[PDB]
Symmetry: none
Subunit: 92 residues, 2 copies
């Protein structure tokens, strides 16, 4: 689960695939358990996955998600706007 | 990654996600390590996984892969035409 009671508790990995609001408290939680360096890296691969088109091998589904959560967190850090996170659409 | 040297060596699972040519040698390999019964089953879930309801979790994709490789193998068994296998095509889109 992403929550335990009323506060966000997910890892970056679970989170990346779930639905939750990025606010100062969830952000605080993630950054402090991942932290900022991995997140930045994940964020980097965002263009690589913003419109990822083609076959995924293993592996890639996960990275897509990690990449999107990554960017979302980086955007939040820049402009402190609470915003809802949901995983990207992966369709055939 | 599906290859000792020059010959195919992948499991059904790795293979299902990778790129390789289905020919009599890779077919022989897979059938003899999976075998024909699981493959047939996987093959059966194919139509489901052709016109899927968009996304389609992690999960779902893995299966679509197994299903996809499954059918390819069954087709090859029927008509022995060497054919390239690649995992199924996807689109990834954001969601605000």
């Amino acid at each position: 689960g992403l929550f335990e009671g009323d506060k966000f508790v997910g890892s970056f990995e679970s989170a990346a695939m779930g639905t939750f609001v990025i606010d100062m408290r969830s952000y605080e939680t993630l950054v402090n358990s991942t932290s900022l360096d991995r997140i930045k890296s994940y964020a980097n691969s965002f263009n690589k996955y913003k419109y990822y088109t083609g076959s995924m091998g293993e592996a890639d589904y996960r990275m897509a998600c990690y990449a999107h959560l990554g960017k979302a967190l980086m955007d939040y850090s820049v402009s402190r706007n609470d915003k809802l996170y949901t995983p990207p659409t992966v369709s055939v």
